[PDB]
């Protein structure tokens, strides 16, 4: 079973994946939680790079996909094999939304690269934690993270446009309060 | 002007690009020399990763492409703009030969990914420094590098098959002695 959280920064998706992780463990599932980029020794090194350096959009994309390629081959495919429930703090939609809708690279091309990195592995369900950029920035403003409104507006739109057109996506209102957001999610997972 | 050296390990291609670099500089060209993977701060960090870590083929290919992409944007395109002669110790044909003909990934896919990392920049000439694997392994045996014959045989074949089918490729016999190899190359470069 593979469960992907997706959405912009400040959407609480990390909080909510950690939430869903602890919950499913208490219900006696065997569970993994991985963040993208990251989740492996090599994936973390790349993540640091992607957070450190002045990188163009093409290079950035190739590194997101490398991290993903690592994650999929090292952890996800063997976790899935042994029936772990695998929870992802970010996955393929986000590459399309950030690097395609955001930074202008070809969406079809990003999709084929996502297929290559994943070896065709797709989530059973994707939770999009949608939120207005206005609200997300207010929430980030409290951790003193400042991010680009004009940019995140595009990325939001992409994420919303991928919900309509990509397969097995549920939009969740993440502007709600923590426990209400978690109940939307548990509701959405009644899917399986 | 862009000049690419390609070929298996122990083909001398590094020695020869350094050779060609010093020469063209002496003849009053403004010249750059860059190795792949590497040639940029980020590219070197990746190269170390590619030399350090147990990496699957899909991941390795994304990291080669990333190094490239960084190289192309940070250095090659602006060096080309100001009429530097740009010399490369490895380029696109090698990703095909190692990752496709060697490790079984789809060639057409490797090509489209090269095009992306290169923004469509192609060498005016590629020197393939061809050599039997037998010879190349003897030569590396004197630096105490040991590499996989069965593997390099495929890669050699790939490199040779690309010379026939890809554009602007000159095969150079690199089994010869240094100075004779250098004269083959200066002959091949006759855009003098």
Curated annotation (Swiss-Prot), chain B:
| Keyword line | ATP-binding, Kinase, Nucleotide biosynthesis, Nucleotide-binding, Transferase
What is one GO biological process annotated to this record? dTTP biosynthetic process
According to the UniProt record, one GO cellular component term is: cytosol
Family annotation (InterPro entries)? P-loop_NTPase (IPR027417), Thymidylate_kin-like_dom (IPR039430), Thymidylate_kin_CS (IPR018095), Thymidylate_kinase (IPR018094)
EC assignment: the record states 2.7.4.9
Name the enzyme group at the top EC level.
transferase
Q: Which GO terms describe its molecular function?
A: ATP binding; dTMP kinase activity
Q: Which residues bind ATP?
A: 7-14
For this protein, what reaction is catalysed? Answer: dTMP + ATP = dTDP + ADP
Function statement? Phosphorylation of dTMP to form dTDP in both de novo and salvage pathways of dTTP synthesis.
Which family is this sequence assigned to?
Answer: Belongs to the thymidylate kinase family.
Instruction: Please name the PANTHER family in this protein's record.
Output: THYMIDYLATE KINASE, UMP-CMP KINASE 2, MITOCHONDRIAL
Q: What is this protein called?
A: Thymidylate kinase
Q: Give the originating organism.
A: Aquifex aeolicus (strain VF5)
Lineage, top ranks: Bacteria, Pseudomonadati, Aquificota, Aquificia, Aquificales
What gene is it encoded by? tmk
